[PDB]
Structures are given as structure tokens and as C-alpha cells.
Enzyme design. Structure first.
Site, PDB file in Angstrom:
ATOM      1  N   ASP B  31      42.365  28.679  24.960  1.00 22.04           N
ATOM      2  CA  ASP B  31      41.084  27.993  24.870  1.00 22.04           C
ATOM      3  C   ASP B  31      40.553  28.100  23.441  1.00 22.04           C
ATOM      4  OD1 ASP B  31      38.354  27.234  25.047  1.00 22.04           O
ATOM      5  OD2 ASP B  31      38.225  27.923  27.124  1.00 22.04           O
ATOM      6  N   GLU B  83      47.476  46.662   0.874  1.00 25.02           N
ATOM      7  CA  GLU B  83      48.463  47.163   1.819  1.00 25.02           C
ATOM      8  C   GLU B  83      49.622  46.186   1.935  1.00 25.02           C
ATOM      9  OE1 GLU B  83      45.349  46.738   5.352  1.00 25.02           O
ATOM     10  OE2 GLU B  83      47.408  46.601   6.097  1.00 25.02           O
ATOM     11  N   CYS B 115      42.845  48.680   4.960  1.00 24.05           N
ATOM     12  CA  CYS B 115      41.765  47.849   4.415  1.00 24.05           C
ATOM     13  C   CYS B 115      40.717  48.637   3.624  1.00 24.05           C
ATOM     14  CB  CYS B 115      41.070  47.068   5.534  1.00 24.05           C
ATOM     15  SG  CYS B 115      42.265  46.331   6.667  1.00 24.05           S
ATOM     16  N   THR B 158      43.646  36.262  13.652  1.00 22.79           N
ATOM     17  CA  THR B 158      42.861  36.992  12.661  1.00 22.79           C
ATOM     18  C   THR B 158      43.581  37.098  11.322  1.00 22.79           C
ATOM     19  OG1 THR B 158      43.630  39.258  13.217  1.00 22.79           O
ATOM     20  CG2 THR B 158      41.859  38.317  14.569  1.00 22.79           C
ATOM     21  N   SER B 208      41.935  49.757  18.031  1.00 16.91           N
ATOM     22  CA  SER B 208      41.554  49.669  16.623  1.00 16.91           C
ATOM     23  C   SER B 208      40.071  49.356  16.474  1.00 16.91           C
ATOM     24  CB  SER B 208      42.407  48.628  15.891  1.00 16.91           C
ATOM     25  OG  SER B 208      41.990  47.297  16.152  1.00 16.91           O
ATOM     26  N   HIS B 250      33.236  45.466   6.680  1.00 13.83           N
ATOM     27  CA  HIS B 250      34.605  44.986   6.758  1.00 13.83           C
ATOM     28  C   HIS B 250      34.731  43.971   7.891  1.00 13.83           C
ATOM     29  CE1 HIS B 250      38.878  44.717   6.866  1.00 13.83           C
ATOM     30  NE2 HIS B 250      38.948  45.282   8.059  1.00 13.83           N
ATOM     31  N   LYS B 259      29.541  43.534  16.318  1.00 14.75           N
ATOM     32  CA  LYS B 259      29.858  44.802  16.970  1.00 14.75           C
ATOM     33  C   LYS B 259      29.491  45.972  16.071  1.00 14.75           C
ATOM     34  CE  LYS B 259      33.906  42.909  19.449  1.00 14.75           C
ATOM     35  NZ  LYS B 259      33.323  42.875  20.806  1.00 14.75           N
ATOM     36  N   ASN B 309      41.172  37.458   7.933  1.00 15.22           N
ATOM     37  CA  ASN B 309      41.231  38.829   7.445  1.00 15.22           C
ATOM     38  C   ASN B 309      42.027  38.862   6.146  1.00 15.22           C
ATOM     39  OD1 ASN B 309      41.029  41.629   7.244  1.00 15.22           O
ATOM     40  ND2 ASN B 309      42.015  42.042   9.224  1.00 15.22           N
TER      41      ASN B 309
HETATM   42  C1  LIG Z   1      43.067  45.264  11.136  1.00 16.45           C
HETATM   43  C2  LIG Z   1      41.941  45.639  10.142  1.00 16.45           C
HETATM   44  O1  LIG Z   1      41.552  44.878   9.350  1.00 16.45           O
HETATM   45  C3  LIG Z   1      41.277  47.009  10.287  1.00 16.45           C
HETATM   46  C4  LIG Z   1      40.262  46.783  11.370  1.00 16.45           C
HETATM   47  O2  LIG Z   1      39.256  46.227  11.177  1.00 16.45           O
HETATM   48  S1  LIG Z   1      40.673  47.356  13.038  1.00 16.45           S
HETATM   49  C5  LIG Z   1      39.396  46.551  14.115  1.00 16.45           C
HETATM   50  C6  LIG Z   1      39.660  45.034  14.304  1.00 16.45           C
HETATM   51  N1  LIG Z   1      41.086  44.930  14.792  1.00 16.45           N
HETATM   52  C7  LIG Z   1      41.902  43.802  14.521  1.00 16.45           C
HETATM   53  O3  LIG Z   1      41.514  42.877  13.935  1.00 16.45           O
HETATM   54  C8  LIG Z   1      43.378  43.910  15.071  1.00 16.45           C
HETATM   55  C9  LIG Z   1      44.117  42.522  15.040  1.00 16.45           C
HETATM   56  N2  LIG Z   1      43.581  41.651  16.053  1.00 16.45           N
HETATM   57  C10 LIG Z   1      43.815  41.890  17.454  1.00 16.45           C
HETATM   58  O4  LIG Z   1      44.456  42.822  17.827  1.00 16.45           O
HETATM   59  C11 LIG Z   1      43.216  40.872  18.403  1.00 16.45           C
HETATM   60  O5  LIG Z   1      43.037  39.685  17.710  1.00 16.45           O
HETATM   61  C12 LIG Z   1      41.809  41.317  18.963  1.00 16.45           C
HETATM   62  C13 LIG Z   1      41.917  42.764  19.663  1.00 16.45           C
HETATM   63  C14 LIG Z   1      40.723  41.300  17.838  1.00 16.45           C
HETATM   64  C15 LIG Z   1      41.379  40.281  20.077  1.00 16.45           C
HETATM   65  O6  LIG Z   1      42.578  40.000  20.784  1.00 16.45           O
HETATM   66  P1  LIG Z   1      42.522  39.658  22.385  1.00 16.45           P
HETATM   67  O7  LIG Z   1      42.753  40.864  23.218  1.00 16.45           O
HETATM   68  O8  LIG Z   1      43.588  38.566  22.653  1.00 16.45           O
HETATM   69  O9  LIG Z   1      41.057  39.000  22.663  1.00 16.45           O
HETATM   70  P2  LIG Z   1      39.904  39.546  23.676  1.00 16.45           P
HETATM   71  O10 LIG Z   1      39.438  40.941  23.213  1.00 16.45           O
HETATM   72  O11 LIG Z   1      40.368  39.517  25.126  1.00 16.45           O
HETATM   73  O12 LIG Z   1      38.702  38.428  23.448  1.00 16.45           O
HETATM   74  C16 LIG Z   1      38.103  38.375  22.189  1.00 16.45           C
HETATM   75  C17 LIG Z   1      36.670  37.793  22.402  1.00 16.45           C
HETATM   76  O13 LIG Z   1      36.801  36.541  22.752  1.00 16.45           O
HETATM   77  C18 LIG Z   1      35.954  36.343  24.119  1.00 16.45           C
HETATM   78  N3  LIG Z   1      36.529  35.152  24.748  1.00 16.45           N
HETATM   79  C19 LIG Z   1      37.732  35.003  25.277  1.00 16.45           C
HETATM   80  N4  LIG Z   1      37.841  33.734  25.720  1.00 16.45           N
HETATM   81  C20 LIG Z   1      36.687  33.107  25.431  1.00 16.45           C
HETATM   82  C21 LIG Z   1      36.266  31.792  25.672  1.00 16.45           C
HETATM   83  N5  LIG Z   1      36.982  30.755  26.291  1.00 16.45           N
HETATM   84  N6  LIG Z   1      35.071  31.395  25.305  1.00 16.45           N
HETATM   85  C22 LIG Z   1      34.235  32.264  24.679  1.00 16.45           C
HETATM   86  N7  LIG Z   1      34.632  33.552  24.436  1.00 16.45           N
HETATM   87  C23 LIG Z   1      35.874  33.958  24.827  1.00 16.45           C
HETATM   88  C24 LIG Z   1      36.152  37.504  24.760  1.00 16.45           C
HETATM   89  O14 LIG Z   1      35.160  37.707  25.833  1.00 16.45           O
HETATM   90  C25 LIG Z   1      35.936  38.504  23.611  1.00 16.45           C
HETATM   91  O15 LIG Z   1      34.636  38.587  23.317  1.00 16.45           O
HETATM   92  P3  LIG Z   1      33.897  39.987  23.014  1.00 16.45           P
HETATM   93  O16 LIG Z   1      34.590  40.671  21.894  1.00 16.45           O
HETATM   94  O17 LIG Z   1      32.483  39.670  22.609  1.00 16.45           O
HETATM   95  O18 LIG Z   1      33.903  40.829  24.274  1.00 16.45           O
END
Ligand SMILES: CC(=O)CC(=O)SCCNC(=O)CCNC(=O)[C@H](O)C(C)(C)COP(=O)(O)OP(=O)(O)OC[C@H]1O[C@@H](n2cnc3c(N)ncnc32)[C@H](O)[C@@H]1OP(=O)(O)O
Ligand SMILES: CC(=O)CC(=O)SCCNC(=O)CCNC(=O)[C@H](O)C(C)(C)COP(=O)(O)OP(=O)(O)OC[C@H]1O[C@@H](n2cnc3c(N)ncnc32)[C@H](O)[C@@H]1OP(=O)(O)O
Lengths: 418, 418
Positions: B31, B83, B115, B158, B208, B250, B259, B309
Site C-alpha cells: 500500500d 559507514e 550514523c 528507507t 533498532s 537523526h 517518535k 536515509n
Molecule cells: C538505520 C539508522 O539509520 C539508525 C537508526 O536510526 S535505527 C532506527 C530506525 N531503523 C531503521 O530505519 C531500520 C531500517 N528500516 C526498517 O527496518 C523498516 O523500514 C522499519 C522497521 C522502519 C519499518 O518496517 P515495517 O516493519 O515493514 O513497517 P511497520 O513498522 O509495520 O509500519 C511502519 C508504519 O507504517 C504504518 N502503516 C502501515 N501501513 C499503513 C497504511 N496503509 N496506511 C497508513 N499507515 C500504515 C504502520 O502502522 C507504522 O506506523 P507507526 O510507526 O506509526 O506505528
């Protein structure tokens, strides 16, 4: 009211095994005198995959904390200088923090520029303290590396490995550094490098010596100008560099220190206001003075000659060997240090040895560190070299030391010796 | 007599191509609202191998020097936080020095902690100046990275890439940093990492996020204690964190900033002397205040949402977007910055926006930077992703920018656009 900053103490970790360098020569069809006289080598540290960058760094840092009774919660910076990194993102410093069970109120990161990376981190820690940001706290800067050129390569007899952990504070018992007087010289070169996915370094050996000496000349001259303006040295009957009690140099191989010292002295002789009265021959003969080398440099190579090149740690192993025996005599005297890394960058800096330097070096117990090692054959060194990075030998770490045990699901696992 | 130190100016470089994030969703059977609303993404930078860490860093640093009329011989430190390193020994900083034809009197090295590496280098440069060692000189700190998780991975939406070059000096027109007030929190974790020889990151995504918020809480609390003692904030009718005009975080994805801001506000609400009068429900409702997010954070995400990112650079892209439009209004006001890197470490720091910040941001001409890009298909993004790192596309760099052209005899070759 006289604030000081610099190195308070150090600790050393070395791999568990070494080879006799004359054994290596014979295995390679080389005259052993090329290595013992030509390079100045005696023993070469060799590793197995369990002695990785993390294990050596953590062993040295844990030893520093124990030997010097460091309060871990006073550490505000933990930096690892290395060119033997094991992750593109996760720094060796973070692994060291976890293995040592250190608390959370510290910066952690790694610094990289070949053999200059440790010095870069040292200066970051020194200037963190000297800015006031680190007042009341200490830093630990660990230089950790494994130098690998490969079987049957020209660099092979200069290999080595180990780590030196430096305690940095407002109580710099080993070396109260002259903040702001550093000289630096850097330029983009391909003298030595190691692409991602290559376990062994690439090097243009004789060019790398020229680059070292060129960068040394710029860095030393930069320091000398600032030291002249600060009144620490003068153009007198003594050359400016002769007024340093000792000079320690990055040691890729022990004979490099004599080349470096000759070059530093040539910088003074070429730059003297009355240099026009001299010739290349008369300057070289004075620069090569055996008396100057013996007085300023020779006693800095005792540990290096038994370990090999440890990249970021080589200069600090030379500092360690110097102070191991002469800290009391050097108390109150100013010494010079030349850091070089291929790529390249050099930095020349100075500091005053502290009254308590002998105390801190006694607690480092360096002959015990070197005595724990065992000699192996060239055949065994070669077998260990051929092991993949994820295949540590099944041996326990020594008490308080660390080893990589395995990589599982891409996560590195370590053991601490009991 | 009032000495200042911090960020004087910045410049941005981005890859030449991007994709529409809704196109990515449709290609993945996702979606599109998950990406646009759930993550906050709009456009994702994509690269080919010619846009490597060096090329992006050199493009940004050269742009900084040209746009801000920096005297290259005044640069005493050139540090690259990344990195996405390309050699175990030779630092990106040395390549940047050569490509920019910079002179020799500077330290060069790279800093590494996911990062957080850029912030680590920024602090080293700031404290070099603040110690006095850098008085009269400037530093350039470049945050350069390409974020790659892989086709059909949870991290894929991302991704991003680019570089931000920071000018650091005693004339910190963008941000006069509060030296010594930083809060820091670090601990050894495997939330995100990238082993040597893996082109794509490994990540436990939801863990993470927890680690980011945990480290943020420690770092912010550490800063707050020091800011309270320095008289910069008070426990009043306003929460301590509300007294910062803006807070930049960040940005791994844009919704992460909300968040983070909620978590920071929760730290104040949990720590207030009268917290016992509150409930988790009442604290969360106050912490999530839309008015606070809108006033302090929302305008920092304009560039991030169009790039993705950029690891070490993400926080500084958020700073850039904030000051791009509000520098004049923010002059004389104190703002907060939260840096996080997986592995992990967080640092929270503050500074005052300068009177000339608007001038320096006008010269960065950031909408022109973003306007030079072109949109490509997901199919083309995938084709470029599958190219090996040594197979740059045959395209010229834009004027003043750089590209990797080839790797020959293990030496990386670059071109500068005419
Ligand atoms: C990596 C760095 O740079 C260092 C850091 O900052 S670590 C912290 C951040 N971590 C990262 O970025 C790691 C890399 N990214 C990931 O692993 C993933 O992209 C992620 C964990 C960020 C999300 O992946 P995911 O599990 O597939 O998505 P999921 O968590 O289920 O949904 C994401 C959001 O979309 C929402 N969503 C899903 N479908 C939706 C829809 N149709 N309409 C509106 N919202 C929707 C979800 O409810 C969720 O919202 P909230 O966060 O507000 O609760
Ligand atoms: C790598 C870093 O850490 C960063 C740096 O410092 S770069 C500068 C130092 N560079 C390195 O260490 C690169 C790695 N090492 C190498 O490439 C090589 O080991 C090396 C270039 C150092 C020497 O390799 P080589 O070409 O096989 O040896 P070669 O230069 O011919 O001889 C070495 C010495 O042994 C002498 N020698 C040779 N045989 C001898 C013999 N039987 N008896 C006595 N002496 C002998 C040679 O005359 C020479 O002496 P001098 O230096 O005083 O002239």
C-alpha cells in the site's frame, strides 16, 4: 593553575604466538641478515582468527583498566584507531565497550587513516579534554591492528599484530602534551592500501618509504615553527631537534626509525640560516650521526623488534619501550613523536614526561606481557594464515583476555579467559 | 572576548537519480500509504556505482568551498564520517583531499560509528578549535553515505544517499555550539550492522527503533542536567525541552522524528519533580502534543523526505532543512540536536543560531541542488542496484561534481565534471 593534558598510562596486548624472523628468512630462501640487520627484526607476531582486532583491543583496554585501577564510569570517550576493521558500520569501540561491561556515558567510535588512525583518536581525546568538555573525565584510545601482507611478499617480514590502549586525562603522567603545537602534513597517495574484501595489503614498498619521509619532513617542520615561537627550542649551537630528549617514530620495521631520524636531522640542517655553507655530503654525514640516534631513538625499539608492525600501535609501542626503561630519567624532559599513516598523513607532536611516568610503566608490566607468548614454526604460521577469518582455533584466552570464538548469524561471539 | 565555535556553513550533494516512493510500493505489492503516511517518505535517492562515498563527499566539500569562498589553506582538519568506507586503510578523507587539490597542512581521517560517525568527527573538529589548537583555522567535516538494504527487504523504502559537508570554525554562523554540555549514551548492541563483504545492511528493524529511543533518552537527559546547571533551561511552567526553539533528530525515515520528539518530551514528563501526579496515559497525551512537534520539529524534514536515509548525514540534512527557511527567525535562539548511530551511540547537543545563518544558507542554494536530479523507474533502480561496485555507468559528472570512473590495478579513478 597549570592545566595539563595527555597520556596518563598505557597497556599492551600481543598475540599468543610468534615466529623467529631467521626461521622466516630460511623458509623464504632469504639471507637471515636481510631481516635481522637490514630490517632490524627479531621476532614476528603471528595470529589465528580468534585474535581479531576486537579481541586484541579489548584485551589491552581491560588490562589498562585493571593495571591502572581506572574507574570505568569516568571514561567519557572510547576510541579505537584501526585499519583492521571488522564491520562497515559497527565500530570496534562498541564491541570493546560491551566486552568490558563499560557504562553508557561515553562517546564510542573508530578512527581510520592507516597507521595514523590511533594518533587521530588520541588528538580527539586530548582536545576533548583541553576544550573543557572532558574536564573531570578520562578517555581510552586503543590502537589495534593485525598487519598482513601475505606469504612470499616483500612486506611479509614486517608483519605483526597487537594493541596498545592509552589512558588520556588531565593527569598525563606519561606525556603532558603540548596542545596546539602539532605539525601536520598530508597528501593523497597510493603508497599502501587495502581494498574492502582483500585480506592482505597492497604496497609499493620503496615509494612508501619516500612518502613517509616526505610527510615526516612537513610535519616536523610545522611543529618546529610552533615550538620556536613558543620558546621550547631555539636555533643555537644545538639543532632544534637535538633539544628533544628523545624522539619516537612510527615503526613499520625497526631500521625505519634510523631513516626517519636522519631525515628529521636533515630538515634542521637544510633549514638553518647558514645552510648555504654546507654540502649534501656534509649534511648527510652530520644527519646520520650515530651519537644522535643512540641518544634520542635507539632505546625505543625493544618491543617493536619482538612484535613487528602493529600499524596504528607501532608509534605507541615505541613510546612504551622508551618509557619502560627510562621514564624516571626522562621525567621533566620534553620528547617528540612522529606518527605516519600511508594514504597519507603525518603528525609530529611533543610533550613532557611526567614525574610519575615510572610508576605508571611499572604497573604496565610489559615484560610479563611479552613473556606469555609461545614460538611456533613457519609451517604453523602458514597454516594459521590460511584459516578463514571465521575459523578461530579452539583455544582459551589467557586470564582477563579475549578471543573471537565464532561468527553465528553474522554476529561475532567472544570469550573472556578465566 | 566572547569566543564561539561550531558550524559556520554547510553544503549538500545528492545522487543524480531518485524514484517516487509510491512507485516503489506498487512494485513491492505494498500500500503506498505505508510509505507516504506510515514512514513519511516522498522520494528516494538511488545510486549507480559511480556515485560512491568519495564522489559524493568530494562533490559536497568542493561545493562548500566554492559557495562559501573558503580559503583551502586555512583548513587544518578534513574528516569524513561514513559507514560506507571503500578501503580498510586509505580514508575517504584522503581521496577528498586529492580530488579537491587541497594543500598539506591538515589532519585527514575518517570516523566510524554507523550514523553517529559524522557527529563524532564534528565534535573532534569543534574541540580541536575550542582547545586552542585550531585557533585561526577551520575544519571541514563531511558526512557521506549510501544506505542500502536490498531489494524486497523491510529496510528498502528507507534507503537513500548523499553527503553534507560542514564548515567548522570560530565563526559559527549556523550554530554556535555549547561546548561541554553534550549528553551521550552508548551501549554494545546488534540492532543494525554491515559485515565486511556485505553490500546490504543487516537490521532488526523494530529493535533498532527501541535502541534509538533508549539511547536518545540517556543522551538527552545527560545534556539536560548540564544545561540546567549552566542556566540555559529551567524546570518551569515550560518543560526543559520546550525551551529549545527547535530540535533536530537523526532521520532514518521522517516519521522517526515524531517518535523521537515524543520520547524526548516523555523524558521531561517522567523526570519532573511532580511526576508522581501523572499517569502513563496523561504523560503520553502531553508528550505527543501536535503543537510541540509542529513548533519544534516539523519543518526539519523537507530535504530528508526527498532523499531518504543518508546515515551520518541525516541529522545534518534535517539541520539544513530547518535553517534553509528559518535561519533569520532563529538567529539568537538555542536549538537542540540528537545524533544516533546503530551499534550504538547517541549524543544530544545544543547551540545558538547565528545572525548570519540566513546568509550562509542562501549561499548553499539547496533547492538548486535538489532540482538537478532526475526521476527513474523502479526497473532502472533495480538494474543499477545489481551493478557491481566496480561498474560505474558511463555518464559525466555535473559541473564541479565527481564520479568514480573505474577501478584499475586496485586504484580508484575519478572524474570531475566540466
Ligand atoms: C538505520 C539508522 O539509520 C539508525 C537508526 O536510526 S535505527 C532506527 C530506525 N531503523 C531503521 O530505519 C531500520 C531500517 N528500516 C526498517 O527496518 C523498516 O523500514 C522499519 C522497521 C522502519 C519499518 O518496517 P515495517 O516493519 O515493514 O513497517 P511497520 O513498522 O509495520 O509500519 C511502519 C508504519 O507504517 C504504518 N502503516 C502501515 N501501513 C499503513 C497504511 N496503509 N496506511 C497508513 N499507515 C500504515 C504502520 O502502522 C507504522 O506506523 P507507526 O510507526 O506509526 O506505528
Ligand atoms: C606500512 C606502514 O606501516 C606505513 C609506513 O610506515 S610506509 C614506510 C615503510 N613501508 C613498509 O613497511 C611497507 C611493507 N614492507 C615492504 O614493502 C618491504 O618489506 C620493504 C620495502 C620495507 C623492504 O623490502 P625489500 O625491497 O625486499 O628489501 P630491500 O629494500 O631491498 O632491503 C632492505 C634492507 O635490507 C639490506 N639488506 C639486504 N640484504 C642484506 C643482507 N644480507 N645483510 C645485511 N643487509 C641486507 C638492504 O641493503 C636494505 O638496507 P637499507 O634499507 O639500509 O638500504
Amino acid at each position: 593553575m597549570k592545566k595539563r593534558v595527555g597520556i596518563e598510562a598505557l597497556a599492551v596486548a600481543v598475540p599468543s604466538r610468534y615466529v623467529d624472523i631467521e626461521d622466516l628468512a630460511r623458509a623464504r630462501g632469504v639471507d637471515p641478515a636481510k631481516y635481522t640487520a637490514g630490517l632490524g627484526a627479531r621476532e614476528m607476531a603471528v595470529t589465528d582468527p580468534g585474535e581479531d582486532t576486537v579481541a586484541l583491543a579489548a584485551t589491552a583496554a581491560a588490562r589498562l583498566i585493571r593495571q591502572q585501577d581506572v574507574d570505568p564510569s569516568r571514561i567519557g570517550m572510547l576510541v579505537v584507531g584501526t585499519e583492521t576493521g571488522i564491520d562497515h558500520s559497527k565500530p570496534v569501540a562498541s564491541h570493546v565497550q560491551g566486552l568490558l561491561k563499560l557504562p553508557r556515558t561515553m562517546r564510542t567510535y573508530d578512527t581510520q587513516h592507516a597507521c595514523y588512525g590511533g594518533t587521530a583518536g588520541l588528538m580527539a581525546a586530548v582536545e576533548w579534554i583541553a576544550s573543557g568538555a572532558g574536564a573531570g573525565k578520562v578517555a581510552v584510545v586503543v590502537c589495534s591492528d593485525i598487519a598482513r601482507y601475505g606469504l612470499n611478499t616483500a612486506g611479509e617480514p614486517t608483519q605483526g599484530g597487537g594493541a596498545v590502549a592509552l589512558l588520556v586525562s588531565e593527569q598525563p603522567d606519561l606525556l603532558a602534551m603540548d596542545v596546539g603545537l602539532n605539525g601536520v602534513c598530508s597528501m593523497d597517495v597510493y603508497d599502501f592500501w587495502r581494498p574492502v574484501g582483500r585480506r592482505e595489503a597492497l604496497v609499493d614498498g620503496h615509494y612508501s618509504i619516500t612518502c613517509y619521509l616526505e610527510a615526516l619532513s612537513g610535519a616536523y617542520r610545522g611543529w618546529r615553527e610552533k615550538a620556536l615561537a613558543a620558546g621550547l627550542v631555539r636555533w643555537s649551537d644545538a639543532l632544534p631537534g637535538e633539544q628533544l630528549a628523545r624522539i619516537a617514530y612510527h615503526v613499520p620495521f625497526c631500521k625505519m626509525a634510523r631513516k626517519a631520524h636522519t631525515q628529521l636531522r636533515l630538515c634542521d640542517l637544510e633549514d638553518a640560516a647558514d645552510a648555504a655553507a654546507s654540502t649534501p655530503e656534509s649534511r648527510e654525514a652530520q644527519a646520520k650521526s650515530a651519537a644522535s640516534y643512540d641518544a634520542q631513538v635507539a632505546t625505543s625499539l625493544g618491543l617493536n623488534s619482538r612484535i613487528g608492525n602493529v600499524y596504528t600501535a607501532s608509534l605507541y609501542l615505541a613510546l612504551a619501550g622508551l618509557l619502560q626503561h627510562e621514564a624516571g630519567a626522562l621525567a621533566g624532559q620534553r620528547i617528540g613523536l612522529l606518527s605516519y599513516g600511508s594514504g597519507c598523513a603525518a603528525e609530529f607532536y611533543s610533550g613532557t614526561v611526567g614525574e610519575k611516568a615510572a610508576e605508571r610503566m611499572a604497573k604496565a608490566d610489559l615484560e610479563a606481557v611479552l613473556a606469555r607468548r609461545e614460538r611456533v614454526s613457519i609451517e604453523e604460521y602458514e597454516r594459521l594464515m590460511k584459516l578463514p577469518a571465521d575459523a578461530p582455533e579452539a583455544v582459551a584466552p589467557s586470564p582477563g583476555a579475549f578471543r573471537l570464538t565464532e561468527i553465528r548469524d553474522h554476529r561475532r561471539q567472544y570469550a573472556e579467559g578465566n
